C-alpha cells in the first residue's frame, strides 16, 4: 500500500511525460462565412458546409 521511501522529482516528471494535452491540428474554414470551427461540427453562427442550419 504505502511506499518504502518517497519518489524523486525526476521519477515524477518522467511519469508526467505522457500527460501532455494534444492540440487541435488546424481548425477548418467555412466556405461562405469564413469562420473557424472544428471538423464535422457546425460553426458558432450555425453554419455547416455552407448551409445555415440552426436559427
Amino acid at each position: 500500500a504505502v511506499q518504502q521511501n518517497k519518489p524523486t522529482r525526476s521519477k515524477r516528471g518522467m511519469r508526467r511525460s505522457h500527460d501532455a494535452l494534444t492540440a487541435v491540428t488546424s481548425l477548418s474554414v467555412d466556405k461562405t462565412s469564413g469562420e473557424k470551427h472544428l471538423r464535422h461540427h457546425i460553426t458558432a453562427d450555425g453554419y455547416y458546409r455552407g448551409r445555415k442550419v440552426i436559427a
Partner: protein, 118 residues
C-alpha cells in the same frame, strides 16, 4: 464481450432507457429540432425513425401502435397528419445529426438532431 450486439446501455436500466427514449421522441416530433448528447442522438435515430415509418399508412391499428409507443395523442396526431404526408417520398433517413461543440458543465459531446424538412 459485446460481439455483434446493438443498443447502448447509456448508464441506465431498461425502463429508464425506454421512458427516456419515449420522452425524447415526443420532444423531437413536437419541436422538429432538439439539442441532445451524441450517443443519445444516435439511439434516438434508431427509436424515432420507425414511428415515422409507421405514420406512412394511416389506420386505426397503426395509430394505436403509435399511441402505444409514444403515449401522447397530440404526438400521434402530428405524426399521422403532418409527418406522414410530408415524408411520403423519401425511403428512410428522416433525421439528421449535427455536432455542436461540447457542453459547458460536463464537457459532454453535443448534437442537434432534426427532421429533414426545414
Amino acid at each position: 464481450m459485446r460481439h455483434r450486439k446493438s443498443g447502448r446501455q447509456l448508464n441506465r436500466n431498461s425502463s429508464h432507457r425506454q421512458a427516456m427514449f419515449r420522452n425524447m421522441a415526443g420532444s423531437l416530433v413536437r419541436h422538429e429540432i432538439i439539442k441532445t448528447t451524441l450517443p443519445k442522438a444516435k439511439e434516438l435515430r434508431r427509436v424515432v425513425e420507425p414511428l415515422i415509418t409507421l405514420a406512412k399508412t394511416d389506420s386505426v391499428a397503426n395509430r394505436r401502435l403509435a399511441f402505444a409507443r409514444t403515449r401522447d395523442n397530440e404526438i400521434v396526431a402530428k405524426l399521422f397528419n403532418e409527418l406522414g404526408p410530408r415524408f411520403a417520398s423519401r425511403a428512410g433517413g428522416y433525421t439528421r445529426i449535427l455536432k455542436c461543440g461540447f457542453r459547458a458543465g460536463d464537457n459532454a459531446p453535443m448534437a442537434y438532431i432534426e427532421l429533414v424538412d426545414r
